[PDB]
Design a protein around this nucleic acid. Structure first.
Lengths: 137, 117, 204, 59, 122
RNA sequence: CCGUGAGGGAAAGGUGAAAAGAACCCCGGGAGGGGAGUGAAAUAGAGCCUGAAACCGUGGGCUUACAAGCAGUCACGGCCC
RNA sequence: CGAAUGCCGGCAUGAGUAACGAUAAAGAGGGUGAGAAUCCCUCUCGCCGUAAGCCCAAGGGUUCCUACGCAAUGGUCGUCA
RNA sequence: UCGAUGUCGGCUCGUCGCAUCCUGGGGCUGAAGAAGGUCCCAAGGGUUGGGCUGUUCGCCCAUUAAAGCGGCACGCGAGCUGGGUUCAGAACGUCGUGAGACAGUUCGGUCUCUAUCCGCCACGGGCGCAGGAGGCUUGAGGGGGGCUCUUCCUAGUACGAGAGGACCGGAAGGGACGCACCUCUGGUUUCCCAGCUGUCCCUCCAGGGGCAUAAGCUGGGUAGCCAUGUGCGGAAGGGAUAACCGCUGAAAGCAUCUAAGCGGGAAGCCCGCCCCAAGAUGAGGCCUCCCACGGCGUCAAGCCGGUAAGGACCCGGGAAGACCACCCGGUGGAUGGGCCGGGGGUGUAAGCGCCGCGAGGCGUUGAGCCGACCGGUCCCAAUCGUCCGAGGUCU
């Protein structure tokens, strides 16, 4: 009754708290791919993230890649067969949330429209935190 | 099935805004306005929002209210003599009551709108 | 024929095996059986269940404490569930198991005075070439001197939706007893917060 | 004038009968407490006004 | 979503470049075709010599599209063109190569060689 | 009044013997009423003698919401004077 | 005289319906008065600006100014014209 | 029918007929199998997308299970189209000395805002349902829906002169169509956020507002409404039959599905499924409530006046809605508004600091603003009230 919502939130218990956060910058990560009788073979997709579409659980995001001649845009649940997700360059510093404009105008024009976000990178420095002090601190 | 969604409106955009504003100035000026019930009913939430902003009294808020009211003399009165009157009251700084009988003119039901207190 | 009163809460999807399965959640709060029809006195057999509990004792004429769990009879009233006669003290969701199949009945959204060509998908007139006040219109509706009339049932414009609708054979995907919750294969008549009834299906 | 037109003058019978639902409803009123008067409900009206509340003029 | 009149880019060395859909070979009335659907198509422009001359009427199999393909797992994929691969009646490709990615839906649809021959299955 | 013009071309009579044409009071902003008053008469009160029909009202009697019709007619029966 | 798509007149029906004549746009506070969305004043809002501003010809012929008016005219209202 | 019955074709909307083009039965076959042929039963459902012509029709392309033929004023112009036919202009070929003329060609050519009755699709008001109420129901009788292809397993096995390929049975995929839905996908999202130009203004700088549409322009975009998106449906099952096939069986010692009887047997009929439905005046059932004459007729309303259970009005509203109706609230309250939190959209506000001569750039900062969504909170508003309404006719 009372929270039409907070009931539904309770069902979403396939949430994740293991994925690096990213936003229209430049990640890359794996999958799951069925074939060959098996549901094995993990395959990596590698691209600029074009748009994250927020909604708590079932927020999706989408990744652009240039496979051979062709552009390819992928779309991802943010949950479930995604084994790992670690990101390439948290660049963008995109002036805007949804950036489909790059579909029409992709090449090096991208690169000099989507320069590095040293700010977010330089806090991934701080996050290096690989001081090997386990069983020692 | 138009309407599964919020905020009544006759007049088009430009002119409806102009109305909420010109009613706001007016309400904040005289403290009592007399209008048709629906107009009154909408004017209610447009002003409460302005009033609230004024209570926080930071430069941003002043600038923020000047978008809709364009008058500094009035905006002042707001921040200095109106918004203090609340400050212990959260939400609902405006009152709307209907009147009996309408206009010999088109028979329109009237309400009045008061600043509360 | 199992069955329970319930409320559509709304939908999302979950994952199964390795696939996204859209579901609509239903809250089927426990349903106090407040009358049983017998063939003897009433003619047919069924069970009248009740649903939404709370009530400021607005019980006036239907005081009808009569059955144990008159526990201030439910806001959202009470409905029968045809041929069905169980453990005479409440109906939970334990009733259902995952995998099972069900028919769901509720109230389609109220579309108001619909056009034809929404009410019916009619073709409508051409956006151009031909004159101009007949784009969303229905065309002809008849012949001429014979029959000199319009037939009964003619698909025309009017009040559409806000009507009963039973969609059939939905998978029950999961049952949360703990919360009287219930997941199915998504897309059940009616808006969220809305009343529904939920019965075992007819593929047998 | 053009395309459809009425085919027969309408009976006084059929006319007065269409008007069956034309009769008006009497305005819905009640007594102003604290004042001797018949107003519509939910309305501030100049016989009185209200209490701690605005109205015409009164000493 | 390919429909008759849609132009399709070819992704092999058959010698065509553009073909244009004349029917989809699903039912008697299948509206659109997508990945793994076979179509008839007229050839519109082509490279000097080869298997396929202009105005030859051939069968191809859609391998990429512009409109996204939804997957069971909720995911989707979308190309920046609609491409086809030309095929002989008993459903083998005529060419020897195939250029650019292809959707894995062709695998379930039994298009093995094509899939092998791609540089990348998405 | 119509038409540039030649030209075309209506409608519209009646208080009462006498104006004695209704002071003054009342409701109303007035218009209109209601009393008072004149008169043989005012349902002769001022485009006022006579005031037909269509048409619109108000009250009263009989009557009608499971019947189908050129509306009437023949018969019975009920209710009303 | 009952018919001439008759002639003049009056009164119906459609009907409380279509419409109320440019989608440049309004709002509030005060006055006035029997009565005000429609008149006066103020302040906000919008529209015109080779004009929708200013001046002249022709045409119109008192429509000009001021004081009284509100039956009718004004496509509503009217204290305004 | 000339005081007017618009007169091809197209579109839109259908509905009917069977002499059936698919799909379901079936008998003959010059039927080996597969695939045909032919006739018989059967419209339940289906019966495609294009090129050419105003075309009807037709031929052609690519498909298809199939690409049926007709009626409904050559259905349908108070529904649209006007390409053709069919006025006035013009031209050709042709006929006439001519003026002109030709189902011969050619280019052009005004298709009318208001629905009174019947009909039809929706939604209400009245009254009735033999006390008065509030719930829940039964289903007479209606309507809806009925489709079909492929691949595989049996088995390359029955059959075969081979060069192919079944019956029966069993599985897994499609195509259209129908009802619902917004999680995903994909649209809109008219002021939710940002950016941009020109000009006028507030207040000079900064910072804002107006107008460039009824959004100036641009880039995004919740809720909702939606299809390209998602879930479902045709069924299984039973019953009676059609053509057709039989059992037993005389009249007629034989024979005969038939005269007595009995079995099989269709996508067709009936039921089963979904939705409407007691104005089903034949007005149904069950649960639960309120019950009294208080005052007057010819003695139970044909009686008024207060009432009872209840119900109206008024008010806040609603994925209900043209109005009405419906549903939910009315202070004992979270109904709307405001405010707060969460979601969500935008994508680091203003101000100050610093950097650069400057346009600018960094930091503060995922900032600032912020519709509808899920909630919380009595701050504002549903104040105070009124009017209805049994008192219950007969063996």
């Amino acid at each position: 009754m009372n929270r039409g919502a907070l009931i539904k939130l309770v069902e979403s218990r396939y949430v994740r708290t293991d994925l690096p956060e990213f936003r229209p910058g430049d990640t890359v990560r794996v999958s799951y791919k069925v074939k060959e009788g098996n549901r094995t073979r993990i395959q990596d997709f590698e691209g600029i993230v074009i748009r994250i579409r927020r909604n708590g659980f079932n927020t999706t995001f989408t990744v652009r890649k240039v496979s051979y001649g062709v552009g390819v845009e992928r779309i991802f649940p943010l949950h479930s067969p995604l084994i790992q997700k670690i990101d390439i360059v948290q660049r963008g510093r995109a002036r805007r949330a949804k950036l489909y404009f790059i579909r029409n105008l992709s090449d090096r024009e991208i690169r000099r429209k989507l320069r590095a976000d040293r700010k977010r990178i330089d806090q991934d420095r701080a996050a290096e935190r690989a001081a090997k002090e386990e069983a020692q601190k | 099935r138009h309407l599964k969604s919020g905020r009544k409106l006759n007049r088009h955009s430009s002119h409806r805004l102009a109305l909420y504003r010109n009613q706001a100035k007016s309400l904040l000026t005289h403290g009592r306005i007399t209008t048709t019930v629906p107009k009154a009913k909408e004017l209610r939430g447009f002003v409460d929002h302005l009033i609230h902003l004024a209570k926080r009294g930071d430069l941003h808020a002043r600038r923020l209210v000047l978008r809709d009211l364009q008058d500094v003399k009035l905006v002042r009165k707001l921040f200095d003599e109106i918004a203090p009157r609340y400050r212990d009251r959260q939400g609902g700084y405006t009152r709307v009551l209907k009147l009996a009988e309408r206009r010999r003119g088109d028979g329109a039901p009237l309400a009045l709108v008061e600043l509360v207190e | 024929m199992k069955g329970i009163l319930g409320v559509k809460v709304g939908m999302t999807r979950i994952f199964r095996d390795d696939r996204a399965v859209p579901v609509t959640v239903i809250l089927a709060g426990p349903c106090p059986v407040v009358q049983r029809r017998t063939p003897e006195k009433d003619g047919y057999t069924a069970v009248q269940l009740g649903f939404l509990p709370q009530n400021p004792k607005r019980v006036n004429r239907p005081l009808k404490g009569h059955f144990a769990k008159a526990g201030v009879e439910p806001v959202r009233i009470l409905r029968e569930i045809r041929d069905f006669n169980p453990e005479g003290d409440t109906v939970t969701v334990e009733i259902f198991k995952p995998g099972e199949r069900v028919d769901v009945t509720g109230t389609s959204k109220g579309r108001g005075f619909a056009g034809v060509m929404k009410r019916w998908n009619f073709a409508g007139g051409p956006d151009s070439h031909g004159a101009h006040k007949i784009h969303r219109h229905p065309g002809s509706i008849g012949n001429r001197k014979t029959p000199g009339r319009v037939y009964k049932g003619k698909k025309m414009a009017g009040h559409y939706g806000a009507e009963r609708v039973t969609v059939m054979n939905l998978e029950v995907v999961d049952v949360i007893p703990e919360e009287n919750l219930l997941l199915v294969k998504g897309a059940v008549p009616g808006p969220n917060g809305g009343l529904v009834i939920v019965r075992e299906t007819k593929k047998a | 004038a053009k395309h459809p037109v009425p085919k027969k003058k309408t009976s006084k019978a059929r006319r007065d009968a269409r008007r069956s639902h034309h009769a008006l409803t009497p305005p819905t009123l009640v007594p102003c407490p604290e004042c001797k008067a018949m107003k519509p409900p939910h309305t501030v009206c100049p016989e009185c006004g209200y209490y701690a509340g605005r109205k015409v003029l009164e000493v | 979503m390919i429909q008759p009149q849609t132009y399709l880019e070819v992704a092999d060395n058959t010698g065509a470049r553009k073909i244009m859909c004349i029917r989809v070979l699903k039912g008697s009335n299948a509206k659109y075709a997508t990945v793994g659907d076979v179509i008839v198509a007229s050839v519109k422009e082509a490279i000097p010599r080869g298997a396929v001359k202009e105005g030859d009427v051939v069968k191809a199999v859609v391998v990429r599209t512009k409109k996204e393909i939804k997957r069971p797992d909720g995911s989707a994929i979308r190309f920046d063109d609609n491409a086809a691969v030309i095929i002989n009646n008993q459903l083998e490709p005529r060419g020897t190569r195939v250029f650019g990615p292809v959707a894995r839906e062709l695998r379930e649809k039994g298009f093995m060689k094509i899939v092998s021959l791609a540089p990348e299955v998405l």
